[PDB]
Amino acid sequence: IPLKDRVSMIFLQYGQIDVIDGAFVLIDIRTHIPVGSVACIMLEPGTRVSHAAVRLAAQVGTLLVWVGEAGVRVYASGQPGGARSDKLLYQAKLALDEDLRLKVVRKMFELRFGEPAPARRSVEQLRGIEGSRVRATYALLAKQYGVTWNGRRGDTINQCISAATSCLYGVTEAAILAAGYAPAIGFVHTGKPLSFVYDIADIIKFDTVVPKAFEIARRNPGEPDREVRLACRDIFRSSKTLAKLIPLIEDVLAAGEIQPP
Amino acid sequence: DRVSMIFLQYGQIDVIDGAFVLIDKTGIRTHIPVGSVACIMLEPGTRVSHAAVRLAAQVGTLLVWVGEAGVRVYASGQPGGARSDKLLYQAKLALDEDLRLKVVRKMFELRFGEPAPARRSVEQLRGIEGSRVRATYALLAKQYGVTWNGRREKGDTINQCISAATSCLYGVTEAAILAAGYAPAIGFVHTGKPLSFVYDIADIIKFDTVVPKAFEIARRNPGEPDREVRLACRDIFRSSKTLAKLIPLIEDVLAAGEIQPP
């Protein structure tokens, strides 16, 4: 039932996904996927989906994400739109107003860095400060883990960061959609299909997920995507990332000081 | 730019030998011009390959999963909408009372072919629109020469056709709004429902499209069996000419706000 109670993510590798006797199944070796009990199903190259399976995924509120190598985003499908105009119009009202936007963004910063932003800065200036601090954190991680690093982008390490954060984004997009909001309307990031997903995921990214990418990349894996995905599955379970994302999305918007729906 | 919408049913969609193609229930292979349409509505019995999805996403074409002939929408690509400029344009217009009323007045004009009366709230315009529905049916009956005793295997050929033709109105309209890049739930006349903007646009399409085409079908009827007439009535949204008008109608409605469109 609710997102809080679900498995984070399942990956489907290469065959046909279909519905047989009402059950969601992958076929090469038939395999039952418990589609209602997972937040996000990831579809790797060489996977074909039937109309029935896409429909049942939407029905039970389970996001479908098509990915390529290193989990790069190909596409997603789900229930059409937020069902509630009051949630959508609240988010849009916050995004469209410059003073309200700034409030949301200052709250995102504070939660990201555990300390409030310097006072009386614009959105653009806070992005610079955030940028600078993030580049320092990657460089410090590279040093600690003994990884060669010429910056964020194909380096093994950049493949690992990509695969890892692509996982987080899928689970973040699930939660945003469950909350009734639009992935495309962001506050820090703007102008991309997943703007809001980036804003929310970036708050929490560096707790364990990006660290784990370094931990894995220092073993010099040849084909890292598989190991990274299983580490992220483990992390989402142990950290209870889903239970964490739901209230974070509402706390961030509430910073605008507009009465929520 | 791209306004065409197409349906695909009972077949496999894939990229074979470089070409984006449908292999239909018979085994015939047809090229689908994916980059040249705004939306592909995938009906039951479709199977899409990962490479087909990837090409559609590259060229920015929406995939929507629907019931037969558009009866309803079960899922959509890029959920919530791919573009913030479109979604924030719609919201801006919906949130400002002055802009909202201008949009609703444009809705009125497209529905009735003439300006509404000058000083009327959204609620009054809705009462008037309701006031005139009997007249519209009567005018279209006379336009097609079809005997008409009013809106009602339920009875009159013309009334059965109207009902069948109305059947996929809401699903196709919802698909067209998703294709134009807007939120179904953010309406202007109707508000508070998951499909409030669908209702607004579908009220226009019902008398600009559905009812005339139903009269057209009833009129040209040489006493065909009613099972066949009913099926052609249900299928009115399969025409390419019809489908192509829907996105531009939606843009025309929202453009009456006088804000520069995305």
Q: How far apart are CA A58 and CA A181, in angstroms?
A: 16
CB B81, CB A81: distance < 8 Å: yes
- With CA atoms as reference, report the closest residue to B48 among B35, B34, B38: B34
Question: CB-CB: which of A63, A93, A184 is closest to B84?
Answer: A184
Q: DSSP string of chain A?
A: --GGGSEEEEEE-SSEEEEETTEEEEE---EE--GGGEEEEEE-TT-EEEHHHHHHHHHTT-EEEEE-GGG-EEEEEESSS-S-HHHHHHHHHHHH-HHHHHHHHHHHHHHHHSSPPPTT--HHHHHHHHHHHHHHHHHHHHHHHT---S-----HHHHHHHHHHHHHHHHHHHHHHHTT--TT--SSS-SSTTHHHHHHHHHHTTTTHHHHHHHHHTT--SS-HHHHHHHHHHHHHHHTHHHHHHHHHHHHHHTT-PPP-
| Interface residue of A16, A88, A94, A198 to substitute, partner B, most B CBs within 10 Å | A88
| CA-to-CA separations, B52 to A45, B64, B176, in angstroms, rounded | 11, 14, 21
Q: Can you read off the two tokens belonging to residue A151?
A: 């910056």
Q: Can you read off the two tokens belonging to residue A191?
A: 């102008």
Residue A86 exposure: Cα atoms within 13 Å on the Cβ side: 6
Phi, psi (degrees; rounded to nearest 5) at B31? -80, 130
Contacts of B127 (CB under 8 A, 6+ apart): none
Q: How far apart are CA B158 and CA A13, in angstroms?
A: 52
CA distance B52 to chain A (A): 9
| Same domain (yes/no): B44, B150 | no
| Same domain (yes/no): B42, B106 | no
Q: Which residues of B touch A16 (CB under 8 A)?
A: 47
Residue B29 one-letter amino acid? R
Method for structure elucidation: X-ray
| Same domain (yes/no): B120, B145 | yes
Phi, psi (degrees; rounded to nearest 5) at A256? -70, -15
CB A202, CB A126: distance < 8 Å: no
Residue A157 one-letter amino acid? I
Burial class (CB in 10 A: 0-12, 13-18, 19+), A233: middle
Q: What is the CATH classification number for the domain harbouring A70?
A: 3.100.10.20
Please give the angle made by the CA atoms of A103, B186 and B166, to the nearest 5 degrees. Answer: 165
Residue whose structure tokens are 């390959």: B49
- With CA atoms as reference, report the closest residue to A246 among A176, A199, A195: A176
Burial class (CB in 10 A: 0-12, 13-18, 19+), B155: exposed
| Same domain (yes/no): B48, B140 | no
Q: How far apart are CA A25 and CA A7, in angstroms?
A: 17
Contacts of A207 (CB under 8 A, 6+ apart): A239
Give the Cβ contact number of residue B131 at 10 Å. Answer: 9
Q: How far apart are CA B90 and CA B112, in angstroms?
A: 23
- With CA atoms as reference, report the closest residue to B93 among B175, B5, B200, B244: B200
Where does residue A70 fall: left (phi above 0), alpha (psi -120 to 50 degrees), or beta otherwise?
Answer: left
Residue whose structure tokens are 């009602």: B152
CA distance A219 to chain B (A): 31
Q: Can you read off the two tokens belonging to residue B215?
A: 């009269």
Q: How far apart are CA A230 and CA A99, in angstroms?
A: 41
Give the Cβ contact number of residue A117 at 10 Å. Answer: 19
Q: Which residues of B touch A93 (CB under 8 A)?
A: 91, 95
Q: Can you read off the two tokens belonging to residue A7?
A: 């498995």
| Same domain (yes/no): A186, A97 | yes
Residue B172 one-letter amino acid? V
Residue whose structure tokens are 């008409």: B148
Domain end among B84, B106, B131: B84
| Same domain (yes/no): B123, B66 | no
- With CA atoms as reference, report the closest residue to A163 among A233, A246, A243, A61: A233
Resolution of the entry in angstroms: 2.0
What is the tally of structural domains in chain A?
A: 2
Phi, psi (degrees; rounded to nearest 5) at B72? -160, 165
CA distance A149 to chain B (A): 31
CA dihedral for A81, A85, A91, A94, sign (positive or negative): positive
| Interface residue of A11, A12, A44, A51 to substitute, partner B, most B CBs within 10 Å | A51
Residue A105 one-letter amino acid? V
- With CA atoms as reference, report the closest residue to B23 among B14, B208, B35: B14
Domain end among B36, B64, B84: B84
A185/B45 CB distance under 8 A: no
| Interface residue of B13, B42, B87 to substitute, partner A, most A CBs within 10 Å | B87
| Same domain (yes/no): B141, B90 | yes
- With CA atoms as reference, report the closest residue to B157 among B234, B218, B219, B75: B218
Residue A170 exposure: Cα atoms within 13 Å on the Cβ side: 33
| Same domain (yes/no): B109, B58 | no
Q: DSSP string of chain B?
A: ----EEEE-SEEEEEETTEEEEEETTS-EEE--GGG-SEEEE-TTEEE-HHHHHHHHHTT-EEEEESGGGS-EEEEESTT-S-HHHHHHHHHHHHSHHHHHHHHHHHHHHHHSSPPPSS--HHHHHHHHHHTHHHHHHHHHHHHT---------S-HHHHHHHHHHTTHHHHHHHHHHHHT--TT--SSS-SSTTHHHHHHHHHHIIIIIHHHHHHHHHH--S--HHHHHHHHHGGGG-HHHHHTHHHHHHHHHHTT-SPP-
Q: Can you read off the two tokens belonging to residue B131?
A: 């006031």
Domain extent for A261: 86-261
| CA-to-CA separations, A147 to A124, A137, A144, A164, A214, in angstroms, rounded | 31, 13, 8, 16, 7
Question: CB-CB: which of B47, B50, B79 is closest to A50?
Answer: B47
B185/A77 CB distance under 8 A: no
| CA-to-CA separations, A48 to A54, B51, B59, B60, in angstroms, rounded | 11, 9, 19, 20
Residue whose structure tokens are 């987080």: A168
Question: CB-CB: which of B42, B44, B186 is closest to A88?
Answer: B186
Q: What is the CATH classification number for the domain harbouring A154?
A: 1.20.120.920
| Same domain (yes/no): A160, A90 | yes
B186/A85 CB distance under 8 A: yes
| Same domain (yes/no): B33, B92 | no
CA distance B41 to chain A (A): 11
- With CA atoms as reference, report the closest residue to A102 among A118, A80, A123: A123
CB A156, CB A149: distance < 8 Å: no
Residue whose structure tokens are 């009366």: B117
CB B74, CB B66: distance < 8 Å: yes
| Total beta-carbon pairs less than 8 A apart between chain A and chain B | 151
Domain end among A54, A85, A116: A85
Q: How far apart are CA B104 and CA B88, in angstroms?
A: 18
Q: How far apart are CA B64 and CA B73, in angstroms?
A: 7
Residue A199 one-letter amino acid? D
| Same domain (yes/no): B173, B70 | no
Q: How far apart are CA A139 and CA A146, in angstroms?
A: 10
| Same domain (yes/no): A42, A130 | no
Q: How far apart are CA B185 and CA B199, in angstroms?
A: 10
Burial class (CB in 10 A: 0-12, 13-18, 19+), B52: buried
